[PDB]
Design a protein around this nucleic acid. Structure first.
Ligand SMILES: Nc1ccn([C@H]2C[C@H](O)[C@@H](COP(=O)(O)OP(=O)(O)OP(=O)(O)O)O2)c(=O)n1
Ligand SMILES: [Ca+2]
Ligand SMILES: [Ca+2]
Ligand SMILES: [Ca+2]
Length: 341
DNA sequence: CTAACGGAATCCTTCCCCC
DNA sequence: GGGGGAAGGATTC
């Protein structure tokens, strides 16, 4: 295979800068205001002018303002970014019909039938970058390799407005030398689980016994890392289908009172049903985020589609079920729909 | 009514019913 | 022994 991976640079911030070019050159921070108090919330992303000083995704807004009090702080306008993203994905369809849309700013392309070698795949990456910059004035990063995992790693290496090829020779070096925490799918809890086993590179998984690795990171991640270490990973590019749609809102104050939580729950249902847009779900899940930011969920699936009225009455019964079987106060309450007709 | 923090989505694992 | 579902967990954007 020859996989071409596209990753939009600082997407949310860059879209805001395209829509307001006076933002060019300044630190821009895209925020998710929870509404509980002034500047409560987290940073969705920031451009590289702000990211260079430690303002990155996930950190609290009030911590970003202690670092950069004079940066531009904009509220997240996800529907604007989604519509811009959808147009860029339509541009990517013109280069390969095997395309896998991974997220709002990521897409894999199987270009095995469109180029002969990596030099031609490289040139196709330039043509794709120039086409996106010409149509939407958005800079992206191209990663090219023999599978999806190393194509994404390639884009991570040359990230800010770049293009990078990891050939079969560098693939083997990375199996020996790339720190295993930088492999997609290995978070801190799985990484620290590899370290305590002594595994720091992919090649280490081939010397260890399988069950000693399986019995503690799981069968799937063990097979996944072993196949990568053997240079035998080759999952195909697949069209991804949205499997669930939901919405969770932060309440103004923690509560275990039914009548106080119900307005937030009903608002989450209305917005979730608007996002359904056609699509008839057969399962509904009420999801509560407790004081300690833990996640509790109670669900129910029907032999038929779920009307909005049925979603209303069933969510209350599922919410009562959460107050019964857990005693932590709820901080965020929401709903999720799945199993579409 | 401004309080040390968002919101959304996937896949995998554990437990349990069931054949 | 294993298919299949409910709920938690880990990951990532
Ligand atoms: N914890 C996070 C991480 C990301 N995002 C959003 C903001 C990003 O614009 C988009 C894609 O995130 P990336 O991981 O691709 O990061 P960026 O595109 O912002 O930066 P980079 O240019 O390094 O990819 O997802 C978010 O809401 N919350
Ligand atoms: Ca990106
Ligand atoms: Ca991305
Ligand atoms: Ca990691």
């Amino acid at each position: 295979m020859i996989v071409l991976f596209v990753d939009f640079d600082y997407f949310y911030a860059q879209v805001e800068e395209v829509l307001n070019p006076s933002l060019k050159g300044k630190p821009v921070v895209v925020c998710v205001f929870s509404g509980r108090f002034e500047d409560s919330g987290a940073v969705a992303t920031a451009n590289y002018e702000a990211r260079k000083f430690g303002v990155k995704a996930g950190i609290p807004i009030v911590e970003a303002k202690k670092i950069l009090p004079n940066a531009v702080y904009l509220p997240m306008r996800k529907e604007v970014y989604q519509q811009v993203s959808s147009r860029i994905m339509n541009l990517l369809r013109e280069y390969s019909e095997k395309i896998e849309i991974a997220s709002i700013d990521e897409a894999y392309l199987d270009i095995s039938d469109k180029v002969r070698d990596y030099r031609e795949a490289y040139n196709l990456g330039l043509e794709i970058k120039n086409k996106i910059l010409e149509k939407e004035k958005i800079t992206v990063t191209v990663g090219i390799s023999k599978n999806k995992v190393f194509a994404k790693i390639a884009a991570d290496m040359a990230k800010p407005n770049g293009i990078k090829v990891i050939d079969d020779e560098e693939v083997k070096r990375l199996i020996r030398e790339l720190d295993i925490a930088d492999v997609p799918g290995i978070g801190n809890i799985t990484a620290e689980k590899l370290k305590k086993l002594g595994i720091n590179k992919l090649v280490d998984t081939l010397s260890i016994e399988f069950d000693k690795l399986k019995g503690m990171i799981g069968e799937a991640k063990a097979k996944y890392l072993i196949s990568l270490a053997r240079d035998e990973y080759n999952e195909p590019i697949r069209t991804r289908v949205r499997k669930s749609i939901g919405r969770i809102v932060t309440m103004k104050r923690n509560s275990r009172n039914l009548e106080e939580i119900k307005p937030y729950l009903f608002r989450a249902i209305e917005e979730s049903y608007y996002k359904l847009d056609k699509r008839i779900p057969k399962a509904i899940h009420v999801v509560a985020v407790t004081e300690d930011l833990d996640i509790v969920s109670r669900g129910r699936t029907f032999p038929h589609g779920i009307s909005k009225e049925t979603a209303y009455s069933e969510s209350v019964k599922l919410l009562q079920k959460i107050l019964e079987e857990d005693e932590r106060k709820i901080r965020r309450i929401g709903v999720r729909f799945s199993k579409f007709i």
